[PDB]
Symmetry: none
Amino acid sequence: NVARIGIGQLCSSSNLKQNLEVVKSLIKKALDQDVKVLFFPEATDYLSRNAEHSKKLASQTPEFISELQSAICQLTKAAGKPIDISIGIHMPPSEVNTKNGDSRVKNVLLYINSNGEILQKYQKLHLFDVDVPILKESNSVQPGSEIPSIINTPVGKLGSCICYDIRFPELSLKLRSKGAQILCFPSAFTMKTGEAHWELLGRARAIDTQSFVVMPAQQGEHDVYADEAVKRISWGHSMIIDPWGRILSAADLTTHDPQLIIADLDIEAQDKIRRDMPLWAQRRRDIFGDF
Amino acid sequence: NVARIGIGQLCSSSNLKQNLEVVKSLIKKALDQDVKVLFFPEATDYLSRNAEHSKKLASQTPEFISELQSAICQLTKAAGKPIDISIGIHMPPSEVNTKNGDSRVKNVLLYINSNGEILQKYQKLHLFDVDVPNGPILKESNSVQPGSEIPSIINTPVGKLGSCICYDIRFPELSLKLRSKGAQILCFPSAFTMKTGEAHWELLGRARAIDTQSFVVMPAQQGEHDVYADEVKRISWGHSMIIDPWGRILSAADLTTHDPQLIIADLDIEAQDKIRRDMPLWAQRRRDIFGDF
């Protein structure tokens, strides 16, 4: 009856089967702690060495997901209680895509309920393209085409984003306009940008929208040679933030083992903050339009 | 081990929670009989008075499905043995469906495993539309959205299943195509009128069985439906039965009671293998004349 959520912080390798064992273990641990909704990071299925490597691994993800859906069903039936999963993966191009000549993976966030049913597939909207030098995420990753609909989770109304989305505030604002009480930003940040902006961005989106903000992150040095030079290290620091900007819960920084970060959301205090500072009633829609 | 299947025959009312209690009772009886896969009819969740009644009742069905998935987990865990469930229901329009003006319900056949996982939602492909000047007028697709896919074969505990729904049975190409994709078993969850039921129900089942050399499961609503039970007369032919690849009726409903009943048969897969080897209808087709499906 308490709005308890959790983050499964980990350090995904390029071995999808290894990564799945960690996810199942974290879900089992979360069920023991009576977590109602468990949030995993971006690219939980795998991190890759390069876009060509990513394309090959993406073909293994459909089997990752199906085994994950069945693990969820088995674990909740064994535990006798439900848990919902939010998890970021790489989706391979469909057969429509193949025929259209699109090879591009899709950065997708799955919302999966306790019966292993996928309720949402949010595809990341914002990609990092720079054209001075030049680096184009969109050469290998297909941008999404929709603002996701709000999900009615066991702990409240969720608006779901992925990683780089966090830097574009109009997306978060729009999700509040559609009724979100909670936002998530499953992510993998570099050490540099992680240290500079990870916590600032989370808190900013929290107070901008007066929402709980879930910040599930990859943490540590990724083994992108575990499916058989290139190095990949994620800032981590997974955390849960309240509508006032307070950090409710953050990762133990003194171990790089996978860990569960838990917080109970005080929805009533959120109602009071939203009532006392009614930012959405105060917008200048005669100036900016209506979204 | 023994390829034991079951049909759950019932008479759905307009009261979803009442119908769910019947469904769970039959699941429990089927676990006690060591049924591996239990087939329910079309519209097991409810029968309605009209299309607007159906549109309102369909909004309750998601809760019906979630509570069924939970009862399956509970009953199998309590029984210590697994069972799979094939059940026809109505699905309300999706969020995007309404965002395009489609308020129509969907005739969907769910396959749900021993862990509550939904492995397939098949949306009925064939609808009864008719517009004869001076009657009969009937446009099922005014109130019901057709599906867009031939379903994939399901690998069940008792063999490869191709799932269809009711009016689908009248279109032999669908059954032939399902055999093409690997089906050993076809199912046609149905609610038939008394007139067409007596004329064609058994004939249609046996025909599709020998056309494709498959086991054919015929789960049916039976009786007069209480379509005012959530607060027009609807009577279903019933006669649920299970048919073998030779057209033999293996097992048939007792017609002397409208009470929910379980109909059971053990499928002789080895005999099917021999029939399909010894009359290889699918090697004998004239694909030079008909193409390939």
